[PDB]
Amino acid sequence: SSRKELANAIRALSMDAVQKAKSGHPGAPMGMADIAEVLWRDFLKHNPQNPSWADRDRFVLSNGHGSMLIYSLLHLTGYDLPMEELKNFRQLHSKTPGHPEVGYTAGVETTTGPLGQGIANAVGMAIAEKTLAAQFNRPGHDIVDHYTYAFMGDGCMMEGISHEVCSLAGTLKLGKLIAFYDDNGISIDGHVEGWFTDDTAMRFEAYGWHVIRDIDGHDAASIKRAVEEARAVTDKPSLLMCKTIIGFGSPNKAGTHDSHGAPLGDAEIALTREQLGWKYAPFEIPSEIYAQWDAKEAGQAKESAWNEKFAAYAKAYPQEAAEFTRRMKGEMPSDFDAKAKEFIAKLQANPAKIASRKASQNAIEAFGPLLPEFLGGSADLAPSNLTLWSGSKAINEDAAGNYIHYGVREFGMTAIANGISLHGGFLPYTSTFLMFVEYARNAVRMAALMKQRQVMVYTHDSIGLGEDGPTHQPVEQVASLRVTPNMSTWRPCDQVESAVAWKYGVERQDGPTALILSRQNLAQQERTEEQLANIARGGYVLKDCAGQPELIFIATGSEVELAVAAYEKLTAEGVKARVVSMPSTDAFDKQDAAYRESVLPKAVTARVAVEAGIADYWYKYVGLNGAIVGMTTFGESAPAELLFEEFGFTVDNVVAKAKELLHHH
């Protein structure tokens, strides 16, 4: 069959699957089909029989609304994605959800849809390949050698995150990253010129990319030459400017916004079949077309050759090969749990009053030698977030390093780190001031949705940061993280809770962990062995009374000391009081009900939450008959000690709120 006929198989499956679902996006799949045919059939290194092959090329659809493009490619090339799944596009619990989802579907590398994040993920995958190659390859043994290919459209280009990640990709000279821009002139509002006029090629040259202009995206020869040129440029990421017609093949909807995001309609599909010369019924693909698209034979041969290379590497470099396998599988070192517990116990036995941002740095220092998979960084705040340890080595200085200076790029940093975790081989950590989780907020959500392990180190967590004032002082950010599905959030009260939280984060297998860390020094709490072991349960009894409590303080982070001081005053008066430290609400909620009852007995309704964050969160644990010593406003610019007084974080106020509560009970 001709290359155009092979590409038209994508067009037919895509328009037909959208039509059957009465939902979805036919235009971009039809516009990019010729580019995909060249890339996938002539260049992409992959094995449909093992989508987890460590050295496969990675493909990313940043314009993820065009999901039928990737489903068509996976089906046609022989992945485990049968025609019946394509006939179930956008239907409940199918393998073909409306935007592609990692884990749902063999061969999907990332969950995309939110524009701009796919290219960010691809930058992270390319950083991962470059770093892993530098760490593991040896003379005569290049066991890491693969490309990262991304498709992206006008929406990704307009989004600010594209600027963040493509700027950094240029700095890092990511010569195995090759992006294809679907330059079709159309977005949802219509002809893009009314709102998007960049000289995109000049912009990308300003980032240090190699740019190939004026590619005919409907001409296989033009596309193939451009890909060859990009592969020959080994010291710059490449952008291929592909002129395409959205909805290519449709006489009445090609080149129109109408083709972007709704079914073409039955009559228009019939006219499209006529224009394309496509003679097959919906969901019919002839054997000749499958024979030319199938990648099982070539893919198995390529993976088998790689397996033989890896076997030879393992003979010459046995310890390195074992580390490669462990890291690509995402497994932890067998002795990590014991060694981390030993560190935690040492901290409990050797008290220190330090900021939890410093306790975080100390945990990185302790775990660094044990976790060579760390690939950490900060968004231009290394000396404030405290993300460097003695073994940190910046990858812009040494490609085999373990640290990224991300610059002032919080959203891009977080979505790059999602790509790093998706690649395999690494455990990424990222960092900024907590307020700027808001810049990165959807990438944080995407880490949780994709079940990815990433530790997110958020410092300067409250009015305790002092004079920088209300634009920087978090109030409501932690509450939002706490109600995000599959997110773990820890607000440690001292250096011991900080190390437990770090351990919890690195040991998650199925989602991310945010650490909520103080600028100011935090006193260490004394703990029994039982309390020490129960920190990891997220909430535990820190101070207690004999018998059933009359009054329970629930406190987190920097406010535990205040709650303890109020507890001591009331205990001396003869109140049966308790303090619960709640470093992680999510870990607490996951405990068995007997444990939760032992900490927060259902019969004890006189509960006072204490936290320098938005009060409204705490109704979850105090209900309608408790009290909350929290924030209800933005902060103020002043020294931290005066702010804590101004906003009611005083022993007198906490005691008064508890006594007022005890009248009612």
- What is the footprint of Ca ion within residues 160-199 (CB under 5 A)? 184, 186
Is 352 a binder of Na ion (CB under 5 A)?
no
Is 238 a binder of Ca ion (CB under 5 A)?
no
The contacts of residue 207 (CB under 8 Å, 6+ apart) are 166, 167, 169, 170
114 marked as binding residue: yes
Read off φ and ψ for residue 459, nearest 5 degrees: -105, 175
115 marked as binding residue: yes
Least Cα distance to 154 among 105, 194, 126, 211 occurs for 194
460 marked as binding residue: yes
CB of 190 to Na ion, least distance (A): 29
Least Cα distance to 499 among 365, 596, 612 occurs for 365
Q: Contacting Ca ion (CB under 5 A), which of 107, 116, 153, 170?
A: 153
Tell me, residue by residue from 97 to 126, as one string, x for binding to Na ion by CB under 5 A and - for no binding: ------------------------------
Q: How far is CA 186 from CA 117, 153, 196, 209, 533, in A?
A: 20, 9, 10, 24, 58
Q: Which is nearer to Ca ion, 153 or 626 (CB)?
A: 153
The answer to whether the CB of 60 falls within 8 A of the CB of 109 is yes
The answer to whether the CB of 38 falls within 8 A of the CB of 293 is no
Task: Identify what 464 binds: Na ion, a copy of itself, Ca ion, none; CB under 5 to 8 Å per kind.
Answer: none
Q: Which is nearer to Ca ion, 184 or 432 (CB)?
A: 184
State how far the Cα of 617 lies from the Cα of 293, in Å rounded to an integer. 54
Q: Which is nearer to a copy of itself, 325 or 632 (CB)?
A: 632
CB of 195 to Ca ion, least distance (A): 12
Q: Which is nearer to a copy of itself, 75 or 141 (CB)?
A: 75
CB of 593 to Ca ion, least distance (A): 51
Reported residue count of the chain is: 665
Q: Which of 410, 497, 559, 561 is flagged as catalytic? A: 410
* Per-position DSSP letters for 129-174, written without gaps between them: HHHHHHHH-BTTB------EEEEE-HHHHHSHHHHHHHHHHHHTT-
CB of 490 to a copy of itself, least distance (A): 17
113 marked as binding residue: yes
Q: Which is nearer to Ca ion, 261 or 469 (CB)?
A: 261
Q: Quote the DSSP letter at residue 577.
A: E
State how far the Cα of 106 lies from the Cα of 108, in Å rounded to an integer. 6
249 marked as binding residue: no
Q: Quote the DSSP letter at residue 394.
A: B
Task: Identify what 48 binds: Ca ion, Na ion, a copy of itself, none; CB under 5 to 8 Å per kind.
Answer: none
The answer to whether the CB of 496 falls within 8 A of the CB of 436 is no
Least Cα distance to 457 among 429, 492, 485, 484 occurs for 429
519 marked as binding residue: yes
Q: Which is nearer to Ca ion, 186 or 506 (CB)?
A: 186
384 marked as binding residue: yes
86 marked as binding residue: no
Q: Which is nearer to a copy of itself, 252 or 396 (CB)?
A: 396
Q: Which of residues 125-184 bind Na ion (CB under 5 A)?
A: 175
CB of 558 to a copy of itself, least distance (A): 19
Tell me, residue by residue from 462 to 491, as one string, x for binding to Ca ion by CB under 5 A and - for no binding: ------------------------------
CB of 148 to Na ion, least distance (A): 10
Q: Contacting Ca ion (CB under 5 A), which of 16, 85, 109, 154?
A: 154
Q: Which is nearer to Ca ion, 259 or 418 (CB)?
A: 259
468 marked as binding residue: yes
Q: How far is CA 341 from CA 336, 366, 495, in A?
A: 8, 11, 14
The answer to whether the CB of 538 falls within 8 A of the CB of 590 is yes
CB of 23 to a copy of itself, least distance (A): 4
Read off φ and ψ for residue 234, nearest 5 degrees: -100, -5
State how far the Cα of 492 lies from the Cα of 583, in Å rounded to an integer. 5
The answer to whether the CB of 121 falls within 8 A of the CB of 419 is yes
Encoded tokens for 155: 């929406």
Is 233 a binder of Na ion (CB under 5 A)?
yes
Task: Identify what 184 binds: Na ion, Ca ion, a copy of itself, none; CB under 5 to 8 Å per kind.
Answer: Ca ion
Task: Identify what 408 binds: Na ion, Ca ion, a copy of itself, none; CB under 5 to 8 Å per kind.
Answer: a copy of itself
| Strand-strand pairing, 403-405 and 374-378 | parallel
320 is catalytic: no
- How many residues bind Na ion, per CB under 5 A? 3
396 marked as binding residue: no
516 marked as binding residue: no
357 marked as binding residue: yes
Task: Identify what 632 binds: Na ion, Ca ion, a copy of itself, none; CB under 5 to 8 Å per kind.
Answer: a copy of itself
Q: How far is CA 222 from CA 72, 233, 488, 511, in A?
A: 23, 17, 48, 42
Q: Which is nearer to Ca ion, 154 or 268 (CB)?
A: 154
Q: Quote the DSSP letter at residue 199.
A: -
Q: Quote the DSSP letter at residue 196.
A: -
Quick one: which segment of 128-136, 154-162, 236-244, 618-626 binds Ca ion (CB under 5 A)?
154-162
Task: Identify what 233 binds: Na ion, a copy of itself, Ca ion, none; CB under 5 to 8 Å per kind.
Answer: Na ion
> Cβ-count burial of 338 within 10 angstroms (0-12 exposed, 13-18 middle, 19+ buried)?
exposed
Least Cα distance to 236 among 141, 126, 156 occurs for 126
Tell me, residue by residue from 259 to 298, as one string, x for binding to Na ion by CB under 5 A and - for no binding: ----------------------------------------
Q: How many CB atoms lie within 10 A of CB 190?
A: 13
The answer to whether the CB of 471 falls within 8 A of the CB of 440 is no
Read off φ and ψ for residue 46, nearest 5 degrees: -160, 160
Which residues of the chain form contacts with Ca ion (CB under 5 A)? 153-154, 184, 186
Catalytic residues, which ones?
Answer: 410
Q: Which residues are annotated as a binding site for substrate?
A: 25, 260, 357, 384, 460, 468, 472, 519
Which residues of the chain form contacts with Na ion (CB under 5 A)? 175, 230, 233
Q: Which residues are annotated as a binding site?
A: 25, 65, 113-115, 154-155, 184, 186, 260, 357, 384, 436, 460, 468, 472, 519
